[PDB]
Amino acid sequence: PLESQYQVGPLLGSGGFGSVYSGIRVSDNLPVAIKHVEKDRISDWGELPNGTRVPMEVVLLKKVSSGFSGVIRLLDWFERPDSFVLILERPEPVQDLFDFITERGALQEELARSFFWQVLEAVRHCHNCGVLHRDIKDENILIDLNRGELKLIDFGSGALLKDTVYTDFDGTRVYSPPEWIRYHRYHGRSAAVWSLGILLYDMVCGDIPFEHDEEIIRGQVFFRQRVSSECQHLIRWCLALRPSDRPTFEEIQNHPWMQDVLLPQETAEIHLH
Numbered sequence: 001p002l003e004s005q006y007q008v009g010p011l012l013g014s015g016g017f018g019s020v021y022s023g024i025r026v027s028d029n030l031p032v033a034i035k036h037v038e039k040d041r042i043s044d045w046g047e048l049p050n051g052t053r054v055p056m057e058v059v060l061l062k063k064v065s066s067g068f069s070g071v072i073r074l075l076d077w078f079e080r081p082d083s084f085v086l087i088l089e090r091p092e093p094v095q096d097l098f099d100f101i102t103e104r105g106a107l108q109e110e111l112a113r114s115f116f117w118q119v120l121e122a123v124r125h126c127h128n129c130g131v132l133h134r135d136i137k138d139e140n141i142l143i144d145l146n147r148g149e150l151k152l153i154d155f156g157s158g159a160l161l162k163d164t165v166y167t168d169f170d171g172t173r174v175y176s177p178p179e180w181i182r183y184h185r186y187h188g189r190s191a192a193v194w195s196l197g198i199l200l201y202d203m204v205c206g207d208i209p210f211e212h213d214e215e216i217i218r219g220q221v222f223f224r225q226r227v228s229s230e231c232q233h234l235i236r237w238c239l240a241l242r243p244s245d246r247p248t249f250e251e252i253q254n255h256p257w258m259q260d261v262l263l264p265q266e267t268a269e270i271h272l273h
């Protein structure tokens with residue numbers, strides 16, 4: 001069962017992702033997050049290799065949850081008559097990156113380099129598993145504050161990765177690329193690199209570069225904080241108006257600004273403890 005296996009604590013939050021509770025696994029006191037979603041509120045459905053009808057979020061989580069990674073892993077799930085319940089890892093102590101940036105302001109470049117590197121590795125993992133997240137942003141990144149490790153959450157907007165065009169999008173608008181705005185058409189990897197350009201700007205400036213559709217498509221990037229010319233160059237490249245002018249993940253990780261990255265533990269020691 002669920003309630004004999006997990007001890008459910010207070011509500012952590014709710015919204016378009018359902019209702020998430022703090023919990024502990026009873027067997028070993030492992031901190032977990034317990035997420036509930038009504039079946040009537042699920043738009044995207046898929047099926048598991050064995051052919052069960054499940055939320056697409058379950059299909060995508062199962063694909064990325066094998067081995068270690070910078071993704072919050074799905075430990076179990078349950079079907080109820082009117083809902084699904086997903087058991088997810090929970091770092092403790094934890095803070096999402098939106099709250100971290102809101103509290104601390106723009107990040108030092110050393111710290112943004114470490115964090116951005118970890119996000120890239122996490123996204124490469126998803127892509128290697130056949131999964132496109134489609135909502136990479138500060139709110140969907142958890143920081144394990146003791147370990148200096150970042151973890152991707154909320155696969156509720158994701159899709160199976162493909163090489164053909166996507167014509168549906170229900171991630172966050174301000175992280176969405178100009179080709180979606182103009183044409184309602186994007187390709188998965190170049191749209192992911194656009195969202196990563198937004199995220200990188202957000203880390204070093206303390207806010208997103210574009211508020212309106214017209215700024216998204218004009219793609220003029222103005223800096224509000226002192227940012228090195230190398231970091232500006234990488235951000236502007238990720239935010240190229242033409243999807244084919246954006247860097248690959250390889251080109252991003254080979255960029256001069258991305259060199260001499262700190263590992264997660266030293267990141268924590270220098271910047272978080």
Ligand SMILES: CN(C)CCCn1cc(C2=C(c3c[nH]c4ccccc34)C(=O)NC2=O)c2ccccc21
Binds near residue numbers: 012072
């Ligand atoms: C703006 N917020 C707080 C969005 C929360 C997004 N979100 C966090 C979580 C998770 C966690 C949360 C950790 N703190 C939270 C506060 C509110 C809601 C969720 C959490 C967690 O520890 N592990 C998670 O997977 C999550 C799980 C499925 C779908 C969306 C999820």
